[PDB]
Design an enzyme around this catalytic site. Structure first.
Site, mmCIF file in Angstrom:
data_model
loop_
_atom_site.group_PDB
_atom_site.id
_atom_site.type_symbol
_atom_site.label_atom_id
_atom_site.label_comp_id
_atom_site.label_asym_id
_atom_site.label_seq_id
_atom_site.Cartn_x
_atom_site.Cartn_y
_atom_site.Cartn_z
ATOM 1 N N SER A 177 4.804 -2.634 -1.951
ATOM 2 C CA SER A 177 6.030 -3.415 -1.782
ATOM 3 C C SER A 177 5.918 -4.377 -0.594
ATOM 4 C CB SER A 177 7.214 -2.461 -1.579
ATOM 5 O OG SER A 177 7.526 -1.726 -2.762
ATOM 6 N N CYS A 208 6.560 2.196 -5.346
ATOM 7 C CA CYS A 208 7.768 1.898 -6.101
ATOM 8 C C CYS A 208 7.450 1.500 -7.539
ATOM 9 C CB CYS A 208 8.514 0.778 -5.390
ATOM 10 S SG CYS A 208 10.038 0.383 -6.196
ATOM 11 N N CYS A 245 10.385 4.029 -7.391
ATOM 12 C CA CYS A 245 11.713 3.569 -7.818
ATOM 13 C C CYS A 245 11.747 3.156 -9.280
ATOM 14 C CB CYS A 245 12.166 2.365 -7.000
ATOM 15 S SG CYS A 245 11.195 1.908 -5.578
ATOM 16 N N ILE A 246 10.752 2.389 -9.716
ATOM 17 C CA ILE A 246 10.825 1.771 -11.037
ATOM 18 C C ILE A 246 10.749 2.826 -12.143
ATOM 19 C CG2 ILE A 246 9.762 0.184 -12.690
ATOM 20 C CD1 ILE A 246 11.381 -1.180 -10.364
ATOM 21 N N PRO A 247 9.663 3.599 -12.256
ATOM 22 C CA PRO A 247 9.629 4.617 -13.322
ATOM 23 C C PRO A 247 10.739 5.634 -13.168
ATOM 24 C CG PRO A 247 7.754 4.826 -11.809
ATOM 25 C CD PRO A 247 8.368 3.504 -11.556
ATOM 26 N N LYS A 248 11.042 6.003 -11.923
ATOM 27 C CA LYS A 248 12.072 7.007 -11.689
ATOM 28 C C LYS A 248 13.425 6.525 -12.201
ATOM 29 C CE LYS A 248 13.903 7.172 -7.653
ATOM 30 N NZ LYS A 248 15.156 6.493 -8.090
ATOM 31 N N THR A 259 -0.060 0.423 4.194
ATOM 32 C CA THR A 259 -0.775 1.397 3.371
ATOM 33 C C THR A 259 0.119 2.495 2.797
ATOM 34 O OG1 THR A 259 -1.434 2.468 5.467
ATOM 35 C CG2 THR A 259 -3.075 1.039 4.392
ATOM 36 N N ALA A 310 13.809 19.427 -1.970
ATOM 37 C CA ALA A 310 15.243 19.153 -2.026
ATOM 38 C C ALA A 310 15.549 17.743 -1.535
ATOM 39 C CB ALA A 310 16.008 20.205 -1.215
ATOM 40 N N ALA A 369 13.021 14.960 -5.248
ATOM 41 C CA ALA A 369 13.119 16.225 -5.970
ATOM 42 C C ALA A 369 14.350 16.255 -6.862
ATOM 43 C CB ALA A 369 13.146 17.389 -4.988
ATOM 44 N N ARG A 397 18.450 16.714 3.270
ATOM 45 C CA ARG A 397 18.479 16.715 4.729
ATOM 46 C C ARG A 397 18.445 15.285 5.263
ATOM 47 N NH1 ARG A 397 17.887 20.359 8.592
ATOM 48 N NH2 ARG A 397 17.527 22.026 7.077
ATOM 49 N N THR A 399 11.927 0.317 -0.362
ATOM 50 C CA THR A 399 11.192 -0.848 -0.851
ATOM 51 C C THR A 399 11.772 -2.165 -0.333
ATOM 52 O OG1 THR A 399 10.068 0.076 -2.775
ATOM 53 C CG2 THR A 399 10.896 -2.152 -3.043
HETATM 54 C C1 LIG Z 1 9.448 9.182 -6.578
HETATM 55 C C2 LIG Z 1 9.670 8.139 -5.484
HETATM 56 C C3 LIG Z 1 10.855 7.475 -5.790
HETATM 57 C C4 LIG Z 1 11.309 6.450 -4.958
HETATM 58 N N1 LIG Z 1 12.581 5.765 -5.310
HETATM 59 C C5 LIG Z 1 13.097 4.717 -4.469
HETATM 60 C C6 LIG Z 1 14.393 4.004 -4.849
HETATM 61 O O1 LIG Z 1 15.036 4.303 -5.822
HETATM 62 N N2 LIG Z 1 14.867 2.930 -3.976
HETATM 63 C C7 LIG Z 1 14.076 2.544 -2.770
HETATM 64 O O2 LIG Z 1 14.439 1.673 -2.067
HETATM 65 N N3 LIG Z 1 12.814 3.241 -2.434
HETATM 66 C C8 LIG Z 1 12.336 4.330 -3.278
HETATM 67 N N4 LIG Z 1 11.075 4.968 -2.928
HETATM 68 C C9 LIG Z 1 10.360 4.541 -1.711
HETATM 69 C C10 LIG Z 1 9.538 3.262 -1.923
HETATM 70 O O3 LIG Z 1 8.644 3.409 -2.983
HETATM 71 C C11 LIG Z 1 8.685 2.993 -0.689
HETATM 72 O O4 LIG Z 1 9.490 2.841 0.455
HETATM 73 C C12 LIG Z 1 7.878 1.714 -0.908
HETATM 74 O O5 LIG Z 1 7.034 1.775 -2.038
HETATM 75 C C13 LIG Z 1 7.049 1.519 0.365
HETATM 76 O O6 LIG Z 1 6.367 0.307 0.279
HETATM 77 P P1 LIG Z 1 5.007 0.206 1.209
HETATM 78 O O7 LIG Z 1 4.486 -1.220 1.133
HETATM 79 O O8 LIG Z 1 5.250 0.684 2.621
HETATM 80 O O9 LIG Z 1 3.858 1.246 0.638
HETATM 81 P P2 LIG Z 1 3.317 1.443 -0.911
HETATM 82 O O10 LIG Z 1 4.284 0.823 -1.902
HETATM 83 O O11 LIG Z 1 3.126 2.928 -1.095
HETATM 84 O O12 LIG Z 1 1.914 0.629 -1.036
HETATM 85 C C14 LIG Z 1 0.865 0.945 -0.173
HETATM 86 C C15 LIG Z 1 -0.398 0.570 -0.977
HETATM 87 O O13 LIG Z 1 -1.451 0.562 -0.195
HETATM 88 C C16 LIG Z 1 -2.521 1.532 -0.892
HETATM 89 N N5 LIG Z 1 -3.429 1.959 0.143
HETATM 90 C C17 LIG Z 1 -3.300 3.041 0.925
HETATM 91 N N6 LIG Z 1 -4.344 3.072 1.779
HETATM 92 C C18 LIG Z 1 -5.101 1.999 1.505
HETATM 93 C C19 LIG Z 1 -6.273 1.548 2.044
HETATM 94 N N7 LIG Z 1 -7.100 2.033 3.127
HETATM 95 N N8 LIG Z 1 -6.843 0.443 1.588
HETATM 96 C C20 LIG Z 1 -6.269 -0.252 0.583
HETATM 97 N N9 LIG Z 1 -5.114 0.193 0.032
HETATM 98 C C21 LIG Z 1 -4.537 1.316 0.503
HETATM 99 C C22 LIG Z 1 -1.782 2.474 -1.430
HETATM 100 O O14 LIG Z 1 -2.531 3.170 -2.510
HETATM 101 C C23 LIG Z 1 -0.622 1.671 -2.033
HETATM 102 O O15 LIG Z 1 -1.016 1.118 -3.212
HETATM 103 C C24 LIG Z 1 10.577 6.074 -3.810
HETATM 104 C C25 LIG Z 1 9.384 6.748 -3.519
HETATM 105 C C26 LIG Z 1 8.951 7.766 -4.348
HETATM 106 C C27 LIG Z 1 7.674 8.551 -4.146
#
Ligand SMILES: Cc1cc2nc3c(=O)[nH]c(=O)nc-3n(C[C@H](O)[C@H](O)[C@H](O)COP(=O)(O)OP(=O)(O)OC[C@H]3O[C@@H](n4cnc5c(N)ncnc54)[C@H](O)[C@@H]3O)c2cc1C
Ligand SMILES: Cc1cc2nc3c(=O)[nH]c(=O)nc-3n(C[C@H](O)[C@H](O)[C@H](O)COP(=O)(O)OP(=O)(O)OC[C@H]3O[C@@H](n4cnc5c(N)ncnc54)[C@H](O)[C@@H]3O)c2cc1C
Ligand SMILES: OCc1c[nH]c2ccccc12
Ligand SMILES: OCc1c[nH]c2ccccc12
Ligand SMILES: [K+]
Ligand SMILES: [K+]
Ligand SMILES: [K+]
Ligand SMILES: [K+]
Lengths: 587, 587
Positions: B112, B149, B154-157, B252, B289, B293, B317, B437
């Site tokens: 994201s 996401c 977020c998207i699949p969920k 990351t 929780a 979850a 929490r 995100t």
């Molecule tokens: C089930 C679940 C549901 C969620 N639902 C929501 C929602 O409804 N609304 C909302 O706002 N947020 C939601 N989130 C949170 C949201 O997905 C994250 O806050 C967001 O994706 C974070 O973006 P990011 O850029 O920090 O990291 P990420 O999107 O996780 O991207 C980081 C990328 O860097 C890759 N990477 C890691 N290390 C390396 C490396 N050394 N070299 C190259 N690439 C690397 C990773 O594999 C990943 O692809 C949810 C999260 C989860 C697990």
């Protein structure tokens, strides 16, 4: 004008106690009044900046400057020892009920505004009567207490909209993995109407119960104001009598218009009839282009109807016309037909409605287009949705002196007062105000507090948000783009916009660039948001919250610095960047 | 600090043009750069209050005070005659590409934040590389570009949530008159997953296309920062090389945690696996929780699953605990079971997953309650949703000097800078920030503008609204009630609240007093709204707009003076009057 407020407050309150928060003698009176179940307003002088000046000014009514001080209908009743002595003598009940008039307040009209006003007034001890009567439609349709929204307006209309939206939900469910086959599912009008009407009935009954429980007198009678303080009432047995009231609130609302053409009244129906119709309309012509017309056409088509809308000129006159066009485009692409630049000339009857069946009759509609060419087509049902109008000359002897405008609506000051000092008007009949249920409720509640609790707050009628519940919903708050450009000039207006796709529409294979939103902003005022517009699902839920921010004077920067909630439709408002001036496509 | 801003802007911008709006020689340069498709930032000195001082301060770099002035990576390139002469000599292309480093920006992480940052930087001429690699889960699950996401968040969920909500839509449709029989309709997991995954694939592909079209270099390789300007990359063939970049953005993200108990890694799964699972989970235990979850448990149960949630202590929490309890109560009343005060000790395998079928295996979960009593039950699928953690020691040689906190997250100043001056961090790995995100997207876009377009605006991380997409959704913005009372004291907090019933739930025979909303307000600050909370349908659409008003400092009076949209759920926020202090029931 502290003394001026006090005089007005004392003269119009029915029962009012002047108190302080930390005052054991005031608590003695409060507890007595509570036990006696005497309702009253209370003014805590310690919580008012001018409380010391008011406390001294009370002596001009009572001879004393102490608290508590109890007043009934402008008469000082006593301090704590006096009120308690009355109570112990079983005399207090009689004193609090003494009045020149039968009621402190007569509300003429038991709809959104009138019920809200009457209930709120009774909270402060105003002896209140609420009059409601539903003049039957041409075919005899009537309904219970609660007004237009409850019985033949927002409530049934949104329920039938929801029935329509569930059509799409059934289609979508397949793509999300559910085993249903939408093509084998049909809709039953009578089942839906029975459900809608059962809910309406619970509202009718609930209003009657609430009024009883709040000691408000409900009269199912037509009221006519024959002098500033006298209301002539006619009950369902045609018995005529006169009740008097100190304050009068006119809250009589409007009814649908019919055009003056042969067959309209005899063979057409309006929204007043539609929501309890004991037969499915069938092939339907909706004449008109108001939000009512489009909302009804939209759900009829989603419930399987063959629906045509006859449009004299434009859709949703008074609304942003870019948005109105997108609304109609969506309807036309989803099975609503439009007869454009067209007006009806006469409705002829080909088959009488079959009361022993759930079948409509059959009608021949003749009309013409603005270039003179003829319209002629058969329909089973013709619905007139060409506007609504007040009905007041049936409620207002011209003798009384309540000024009406050219449209028959009541001319009011910004505190809802008519040209007769004790007579007020709220809701749709108040000239120049947005004609919306929450407006009428707020105006009525706030007016009741000013009359009977010494409040000063006025209703704010600016930037009232709307939502049109067409198949794809349209929410707005503030100015249309064209009104903004007219008021400030094109060079001072910046419009940020974007299409969007609800995530829910992706797996469901719905359209990618039909939902749309825009912010109409004023450059010279720090990009102030003059108008917000959104076409998409749940548009009312989307729009509502932003109406607070617009009320507070939100700018484009206020939207930008806010973080979106993901995944939602509404979050797209927080990242808009494409301007209309730029020419870049919004897709 | 105008000179200080100029120095920083000139030193870090990749290609930047200092211009004026009304300057024909500047337009000459702009048009040339446009034809040459040289992307650059532009600073219109006439639209800056300190533009005259900046114009003079430019001479300290260029010797001249005229516009236009073009800079590349801190080097003055020329005025209009010089830039045009370079272009006519076919020399400009080489000059704009001259750099000490391979890239102006290396983004480590293609999620994201990272994609948002990289795309925005390239808009201003920064030569940008985006590295993304998805370390497979224990069972081998991987996915494409776009981050958590897009692929497993977020998207699949929310899509699977929508599949679940459609269950209720099918039930409701009957009451609204549709002829379906919900009891004969079933759900097919594989059909849903195929649809969800097809959309995700369109996003994976769309990101790759967009980066190409924006001239951003996409490397599907794991990046490791081995010195402030050197990134070691390992591609899928295990080939190791080094690229250099001026600025580095660490983006990351995190991955799910597993508890350190036998069988967890071998036999359980996480959300990373769930959204592409090639078999229905069946009887499922969700351990945890968190919002993840509860969201997953909720849609699994609505899709017909037998679902249990194992809760160590409390639900959600860090969220308002009154709301968390209502969220769980609703889930428990709609078929989710809860194992309370309970933790797992070991997962034993009873049946191996049957790859030649859409069937899960079978597992024995042993655990214990806080009083020491034993938990033992069989499940087909065990999902660990006990939190997420950063993965940085695999990305950060301690040699480099980027400070991490006790949790392994990056310690940043309020402009996202790490303890290494050219290295920044955004998204979930930035310590102390909301892990959402839209936060990551805003932080990344705004940082890119500061680095390469001379912007100064920071991301505002306060009062970021959330929505938990449980079966009945929970939206919030601002403080929980308990946090408000802790910060200001109970006597300074007033809470207005109300239950409500969506109109859509009336004909559908759903619950009357389950939806709930409240405003947590501060008395001594004019009843400032400290926190807004809503449990109901479409909670994210409801909440979003109010986050703007709260950002602007909305008070209770701002909500009251706003008029509701009727009929909506959201309008109930505009008429709240029952306080918790009063003791009056909210029903
Ligand atoms: C089930 C679940 C549901 C969620 N639902 C929501 C929602 O409804 N609304 C909302 O706002 N947020 C939601 N989130 C949170 C949201 O997905 C994250 O806050 C967001 O994706 C974070 O973006 P990011 O850029 O920090 O990291 P990420 O999107 O996780 O991207 C980081 C990328 O860097 C890759 N990477 C890691 N290390 C390396 C490396 N050394 N070299 C190259 N690439 C690397 C990773 O594999 C990943 O692809 C949810 C999260 C989860 C697990
Ligand atoms: C199809 C339709 C759909 C609508 N949808 C929406 C929507 O989605 N959202 C929204 O905000 N607004 C909507 N409205 C508008 C809303 O219904 C009105 O603004 C609201 O009902 C006005 O309230 P009121 O108190 O002024 O009058 P009313 O609610 O009309 O009540 C006036 C009452 O007084 C009665 N009365 C009249 N004369 C007398 C008399 N002499 N004596 C005694 N009683 C009398 C009337 O019969 C009526 O019962 C809709 C209207 C229509 C027709
Ligand atoms: O085709 C539907 C439609 C879009 N705009 C309109 C204006 C007037 C009449 C109908 C329409
Ligand atoms: O019954 C569901 C539920 C409501 N509150 C909870 C707190 C902890 C675990 C479960 C619950
Ligand atoms: K209202
Ligand atoms: K934003
Ligand atoms: K964002
Ligand atoms: K209000």
């Amino acid at each position: 004008g502290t003394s001026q407020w006090l005089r007005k407050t004392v003269d119009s309150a029915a029962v009012i106690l002047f108190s302080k928060t930390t005052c054991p003698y005031c608590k003695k009176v409060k507890d007595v009044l509570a036990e006696a179940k005497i309702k009253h307003a209370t003014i805590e002088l310690d919580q008012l900046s001018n409380g010391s000046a008011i406390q001294k000014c009370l002596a001009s009514f009572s001879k004393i400057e102490t608290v508590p001080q109890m007043f009934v209908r402008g008469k000082f009743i006593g301090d704590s020892q006096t009120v308690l002595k009355y109570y112990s003598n079983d005399e207090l009940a009689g004193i609090v009920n003494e009045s020149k008039y039968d009621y402190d307040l007569i509300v003429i009209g038991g709809g959104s505004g009138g019920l809200a006003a009457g209930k709120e007034a009774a909270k402060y001890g105003a002896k209140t009567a609420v009059l409601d009567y539903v003049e039957p439609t041409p075919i005899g349709t009537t309904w219970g207490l609660g007004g237009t929204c409850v019985n033949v307006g927002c409530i049934p209309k949104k329920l039938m909209h929801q029935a329509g939206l569930l059509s799409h939900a059934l289609e979508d469910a397949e793509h999300f993995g559910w085993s249903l086959d939408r093509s084998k599912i049909s809709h039953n009008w009578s089942t839906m109407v029975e459900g809608v009407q059962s809910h309406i009935g619970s509202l009718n009954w609930g209003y009657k119960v609430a009024l009883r429980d709040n000691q408000v007198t409900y009269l199912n009678a037509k009221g006519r104001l024959i002098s500033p303080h006298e209301v002539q009432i006619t009950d369902k047995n045609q018995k005529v009598s006169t009740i008097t009231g100190n304050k009068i609130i006119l809250a009589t609302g409007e009814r649908p218009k019919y055009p003056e053409i042969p067959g309209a009244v005899e063979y057409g129906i309006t929204s007043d009839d539609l929501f309890s119709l004991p037969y499915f309309p069938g092939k339907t012509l909706v004449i008109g282009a108001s939000y009512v017309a489009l909302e009804c056409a939209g759900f009829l088509a989603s419930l399987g109807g063959d629906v045509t809308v006859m449009v004299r000129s434009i859709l949703l006159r008074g609304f942003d016309q870019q948005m109105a066009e997108k609304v109609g485009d969506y309807m036309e692409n989803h099975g609503v037909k439009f007869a454009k630049l067209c007006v009806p000339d006469e409705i002829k009857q080909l088959k009488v409605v079959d009361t022993e069946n759930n079948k409509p009759g059959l009608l021949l509609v003749k009309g013409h287009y603005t270039d003179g060419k003829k319209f002629e087509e058969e329909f089973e049902t013709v619905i007139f949705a060409v506007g609504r109008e007040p009905q007041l000359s049936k409620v207002l002897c011209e003798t009384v002196g309540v000024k009406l405008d050219k449209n028959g609506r009541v001319v009011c000051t910004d505190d809802e007062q008519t040209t007769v000092s004790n007579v007020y008007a709220i809701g749709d009949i108040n000239a120049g105000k947005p004609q919306l249920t929450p407006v009428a409720i707020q105006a009525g509640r706030y007016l009741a507090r000013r009359l009977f609790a010494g409040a000063t707050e006025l209703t704010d009628y600016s930037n009232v948000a709307t939502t049109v519940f067409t198949p794809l919903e349209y929410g707005a708050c503030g100015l249309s783009e064209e009104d903004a450009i007219e008021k400030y000039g094109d060079k001072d207006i910046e419009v940020y916009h974007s299409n969007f796709k609800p995530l829910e529409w992706t797996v469901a294979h719905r359209e990618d660039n039909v939902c749309y939103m825009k912010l109409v902003c004023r450059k010279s005022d720090n990009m102030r948001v003059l108008g917000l517009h959104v076409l998409g699902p749940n548009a009312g839920e989307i729009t509502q919250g932003y109406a607070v921010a617009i009320k507070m004077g939100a700018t484009k920067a206020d939207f930008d610095r806010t973080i979106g909630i993901h995944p939602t439709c509404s979050e797209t408002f927080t990242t808009l960047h494409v301007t209309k001036k730029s020419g870049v496509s919004p897709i």
